[PDB]
RNA sequence: ACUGGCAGACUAGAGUACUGUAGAGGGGGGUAGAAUUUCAGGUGUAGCGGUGAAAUGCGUAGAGAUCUGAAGGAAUACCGGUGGCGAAGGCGGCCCCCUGGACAGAUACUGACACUCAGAUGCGAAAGCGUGGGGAGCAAACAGGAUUAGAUACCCUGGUAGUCCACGCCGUAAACGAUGUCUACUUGGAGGUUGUGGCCUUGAGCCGUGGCUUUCGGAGCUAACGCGUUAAGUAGACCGCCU
């Protein structure tokens, strides 16, 4: 069964970037869209779009720079089989601060930088580098 | 079966009428018991060789 | 094995709505009918191990649907049990 | 009910009895709610190999509708009738009321 | 549409020995070949075809 | 926010109903033809059989060969296929009866009912075991003949258990793809097979769309060999296992 939609999102992006696909579509969800918004903010994707009302699909436009894919790493951290929650003082730095770690805080979903500045910890979704 | 309609023809026609009923082929099959495993092993290697021929015989400069 | 007329008798009897084929109630009732019919077969055909694997999938599936419904509406679950004669 | 195609081949000597057979056999079928779709006495024909040292036999083709109980009856009849040399009963999907290759010839 | 009664057709698909001919030779579709082989074998039981040239 | 709970909602997962389709899927029963062996009779007359050669063996009491018949058992030539079906083991003549699964199309239904599974349960080649049958062929053991330095072997002539059936038991195999199950994603080429739709079937076809399967290869992966959309790639869930 598919028991981790988020990891599926990340896989789809990671495999898209690997196959030099322009965009990737997947079944949308709140958290997928939230992730896609952060990834846009941080400049790792080009854009996203949620089409459909009945069964909404998400379309991440992937980003390349010098014909290498912008996303090098897209590691899921908090799996379903092992959740990972870090306090603010214990938030992961990624690629020596040059990558993000997507934290889910109780005031939304943010990069580890913004979480530290906010003095929130939360659930670590993934590392993007 | 060959009705002699010269004999020399008739025996050649005979010899080709029994090729085509795989008669001698069949006797040699059933002289000794081929164990079923061995039958299959032969049949796979047959197919495998036949393909591995055609494949590289389409890849078939020399000079 | 259950043909179409016998199915339809059931699908009409246990339907929880209009042209309900898919309620637990219908599904379980059909499986119960299949299982009960097939009991004759395996009395006459104990060695039929291959068909029995298919019998046991019905037995399994029944349980799963029955565990579903009990989890949803316990009262519906209690009805269905009583109507079918299942001691689940 | 199910549709069958029955071919039974009668011993040549008893070729006279054949027409009697057709009647009585279909009798049982017709009786028990059983349609007879096709009935094609092909006559005597040369057997493609000896059956009981016989070289000819009287073929009879009969397509019926019936329940299996009726055909269980027939197969047993054909067994014990010493004139009926072979018989192949085949379940068919749908009734056949045409004419066969055999009779077209 | 193959009948155990259509001897004439079936005979195009048996050798002189009585053997069923490969689908490779005849060019029959796998599905057809299967249905021939079944018919030929029913014919043989009704002594409409022979099993063997010998008999 | 995310995970959980609780109360609802949803249809993509999973399942149901309908109609088809292909198939050595399973169980039961019947039957056909070829062949082997034995037997009976006919013909016939000195070999036959076997091997590297030979001998044991068989044959003048008539073999072997040939014809006819009979009786048995076992297995189903051709079709037949890197075809098919099955969870795996495995499944091959034909016919019937009972029966499982898969797949496709179409519409309707249920509404996460799912995935995996410690322990548990069931199925599980061949050999083997019990009881009762059966016993053509084959053949552990065994006997004899050869070979050899020897030959407790290989080879030859025989040959019993076993092989077959019923009902149990056993629970193992290089039970192998030496590759856990489930899910999603990621260039292609050539095939096979089984559905379905369209076109003009304007002429066997061509083009879509599914299922299953074979092969070659790209990226990637890998110690390498290789694997390569049926992954040994990219990820997730769970189990088994290694040190």
Automatic annotation (TrEMBL), chain A:
For this protein, the record's InterPro entries field holds: Ribosomal_uS8, Ribosomal_uS8_CS, Ribosomal_uS8_sf
What keywords appear on the UniProt entry? Answer: Ribonucleoprotein, Ribosomal protein, RNA-binding, rRNA-binding
What is the name of the protein in this document?
Small ribosomal subunit protein uS8
Example GO CC term: the record gives:
ribonucleoprotein complex
| Family, as annotated | Belongs to the universal ribosomal protein uS8 family.
Q: Which organism is it from?
A: Vibrio natriegens NBRC 15636 = ATCC 14048 = DSM 759
Top-level taxon of the source organism: Bacteria
Instruction: Write down the PROSITE patterns for this protein, in alphabetical order.
Output: RIBOSOMAL_S8
Name its GO BP terms in alphabetical order: translation
Q: How does it assemble?
A: Part of the 30S ribosomal subunit. Contacts proteins S5 and S12.
The molecular function terms in GO held by this entry are: rRNA binding; structural constituent of ribosome
Could you confirm whether the keyword RNA-binding appears in this record? Answer: yes
The reply on keyword Metal-binding is no
PANTHER family registered for this protein in UniProt: 40S RIBOSOMAL PROTEIN S15A (PTHR11758)
Instruction: Name the job this protein performs.
Output: One of the primary rRNA binding proteins, it binds directly to 16S rRNA central domain where it helps coordinate assembly of the platform of the 30S subunit.
From TrEMBL, chain C:
The protein's UniProt keywords, in alphabetical order, are: Ribonucleoprotein, Ribosomal protein, RNA-binding, rRNA-binding
Q: What HAMAP family does the entry give?
A: Ribosomal_uS15_B
Instruction: Give the CC-aspect GO terms.
Output: cytosolic small ribosomal subunit
Task: Please give a single GO biological process term from the UniProt record.
Answer: translation
Kindly give the InterPro entries that the UniProt entry links to this protein. Answer: Ribosomal_uS15, Ribosomal_uS15_bac-type, uS15_NS1_RNA-bd_sf
> Partners and quaternary state?
Part of the 30S ribosomal subunit. Forms a bridge to the 50S subunit in the 70S ribosome, contacting the 23S rRNA.
Q: Which family would the database say this protein is a member of? A: Belongs to the universal ribosomal protein uS15 family.
| Species whose genome carries this gene | Vibrio natriegens NBRC 15636 = ATCC 14048 = DSM 759
NCBIfam families in the cross-refs: S15_bact
SMART domains, per database record: Ribosomal_S15
Protein name per UniProt: Small ribosomal subunit protein uS15
Asked if the keyword rRNA-binding belongs to this entry, the reply reads yes
Q: Does the keyword RNA-binding apply?
A: yes
The gene is rpsO
- Molecular function terms in GO for this entry? rRNA binding; structural constituent of ribosome
Coiled-coil annotation reads none
Pfam families, per database record: Ribosomal_S15
Quote the function comment for this protein.
Forms an intersubunit bridge (bridge B4) with the 23S rRNA of the 50S subunit in the ribosome.
Automatic annotation (TrEMBL), chain D:
Swiss-Prot/TrEMBL GO biological process terms? translation
Superkingdom field: Bacteria
User: Which GO molecular function annotations are given, in alphabetical order?
Assistant: small ribosomal subunit rRNA binding; structural constituent of ribosome
- Looking at the keywords, is Manganese present? no
Q: Which UniProt keywords apply?
A: Ribonucleoprotein, Ribosomal protein, RNA-binding, rRNA-binding
**Gene Ontology cellular-component annotations:** cytosolic small ribosomal subunit
**Is RNA-binding one of the keywords?**
yes
Q: What does this protein do?
A: Binds together with bS18 to 16S ribosomal RNA.
* Protein family per UniProt: Belongs to the bacterial ribosomal protein bS6 family.
Q: State the protein's name.
A: Small ribosomal subunit protein bS6
Automatic annotation (TrEMBL), chain E:
UniProt lists the family membership as follows:
Belongs to the bacterial ribosomal protein bS18 family.
UniProt KW keywords:
Ribonucleoprotein, Ribosomal protein, RNA-binding, rRNA-binding
GO terms under biological process = translation
Role of this protein = Binds as a heterodimer with protein bS6 to the central domain of the 16S rRNA, where it helps stabilize the platform of the 30S subunit.
Give the domain of life.
Answer: Bacteria
The protein's gene is named rpsR
Q: What is this protein called?
A: Small ribosomal subunit protein bS18
The subunit field of the Swiss-Prot or TrEMBL record says: Part of the 30S ribosomal subunit. Forms a tight heterodimer with protein bS6.
Supply the source organism for this entry: Vibrio natriegens NBRC 15636 = ATCC 14048 = DSM 759
GO cellular component term of the entry, any:
cytosolic small ribosomal subunit
- GO MF term set: small ribosomal subunit rRNA binding; structural constituent of ribosome
């Amino acid at each position: 069964s598919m028991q981790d939609p988020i990891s599926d999102m990340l896989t789809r992006v990671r495999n898209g970037q690997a196959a030099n696909k322009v965009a990737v579509k997947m079944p949308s969800s709140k958290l997928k869209v939230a992730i896609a918004a952060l990834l846009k903010a941080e400049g790792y994707i080009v854009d996203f779009a949620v089409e459909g009302e009945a069964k909404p699909e998400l379309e991440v436009t992937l980003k390349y720079f010098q014909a290498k894919p912008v996303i090098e790493q897209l590691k899921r951290v908090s799996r379903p089989g092992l959740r990972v929650y870090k306090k603010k003082d214990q938030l992961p730095s990624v690629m020596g601060g040059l990558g993000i770690a997507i934290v889910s805080t109780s005031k939304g979903l943010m990069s580890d930088r913004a979480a530290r500045k906010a003095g929130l910890g939360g659930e670590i979704i993934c590392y993007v580098a | 079966v060959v009705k002699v309609r010269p004999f020399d023809v008739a025996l050649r026609r005979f010899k080709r009428s029994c090729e085509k009923a795989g008669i001698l082929s069949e006797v040699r099959r059933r002289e000794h018991y081929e164990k079923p495993t061995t039958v299959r092993k032969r049949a796979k290697a047959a197919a495998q060789k036949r393909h591995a021929k055609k494949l590289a015989r389409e890849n078939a400069r020399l000079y | 094995s259950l043909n179409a007329e016998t199915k339809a008798a059931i699908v009409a009897e246990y339907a929880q709505s209009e042209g309900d084929t898919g309620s637990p109630e219908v599904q379980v009732a059909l499986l119960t009918a299949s299982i009960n019919h097939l009991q004759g077969h395996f009395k006459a055909h104990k060695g039929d191990h291959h068909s029995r694997r298919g019998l046991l999938r019905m037995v399994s599936r029944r349980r799963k649907l029955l565990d579903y419904l009990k989890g949803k509406n316990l009262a519906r679950y209690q009805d269905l049990i009583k109507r079918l004669g299942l001691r689940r | 009910m199910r549709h069958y195609e029955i071919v039974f081949m009668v011993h040549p000597d008893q070729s006279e009895q054949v027409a009697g057979m057709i009647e009585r056999y279909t009798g049982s079928i017709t009786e028990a709610g059983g349609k007879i779709h096709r009935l094609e006495d092909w006559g005597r024909r040369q057997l493609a190999y000896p059956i009981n040292k016989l070289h000819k036999a009287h073929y009879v083709l009969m397509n019926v509708e019936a329940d299996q109980a009726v055909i269980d009856e027939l197969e047993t009849a054909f067994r014990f009738n010493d004139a009926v040399l072979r018989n192949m009963v085949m379940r068919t999907k749908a009734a056949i009321t045409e004419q066969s290759i055999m009779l077209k010839q | 549409e193959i009948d155990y009664k259509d001897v004439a057709t079936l005979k195009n698909y048996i050798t002189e020995a009585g053997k069923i001919v490969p689908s490779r030779i005849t060019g029959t579709s796998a599905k057809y070949q299967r249905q021939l082989a079944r018919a030929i074998k029913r014919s043989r039981y009704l002594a409409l075809l022979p099993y063997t040239d010998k008999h």
